[PDB]
């Protein structure tokens, strides 16, 4: 029931984790991504995160397993807690706005190179008051 747009988005996201393109996400790959976002997960945290998404016990995530995880996340309502934590991932300087520079930084660090025009468009998907940045209320509205 996923559309070609959605599948394309999920494949692009998968590619940011599966840097070697071997078709699976490993604990090492997940660790690299999370450290690029400014987190410092422990080895146990990474193992649990991979293993809770894995469906067949081989200790890695393939694209069908990732799709199952994403399709569920998209249907689900998001918690206040997880939205607040995610906002801080982008709002590096803690000023209560996600700027175009901060969003581009996060995308670059994940391995997705965007043009300024592409970053600005992603910001437009959330900005409401027209200042070209995303405050917390705008971020919450986007996620709800």
């Amino acid at each position: 029931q996923l559309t070609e747009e959605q599948i394309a988005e999920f494949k692009e996201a998968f590619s940011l984790f599966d840097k070697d393109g071997d078709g699976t996400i490993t604990t090492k790959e997940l660790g690299t991504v999370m450290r690029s976002l400014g987190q410092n997960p422990t080895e146990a945290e990474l193992q649990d995160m991979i293993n809770e998404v894995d469906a067949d016990g081989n200790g890695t995530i393939d694209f069908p397993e990732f799709l199952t995880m994403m399709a569920r996340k998209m249907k689900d309502t998001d918690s206040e807690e997880e939205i607040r934590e995610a906002f801080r991932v982008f709002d590096k300087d803690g000023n209560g706005y996600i700027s175009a520079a901060e969003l581009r930084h996060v995308m670059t660090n994940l391995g997705e190179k965007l043009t300024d025009e592409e970053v600005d468009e992603m910001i437009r998907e959330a900005d409401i008051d027209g200042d070209g940045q995303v405050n917390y209320e705008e971020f919450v509205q986007m996620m709800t």
Partner: peptide
């Protein structure tokens, strides 16, 4: 081709 990830989808990824 360049595949855009919409901002909302990206955030969902960052939830883990």
């Amino acid at each position: 081709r360049r595949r855009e990830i919409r901002f909302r989808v990206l955030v969902k990824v960052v939830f883990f």
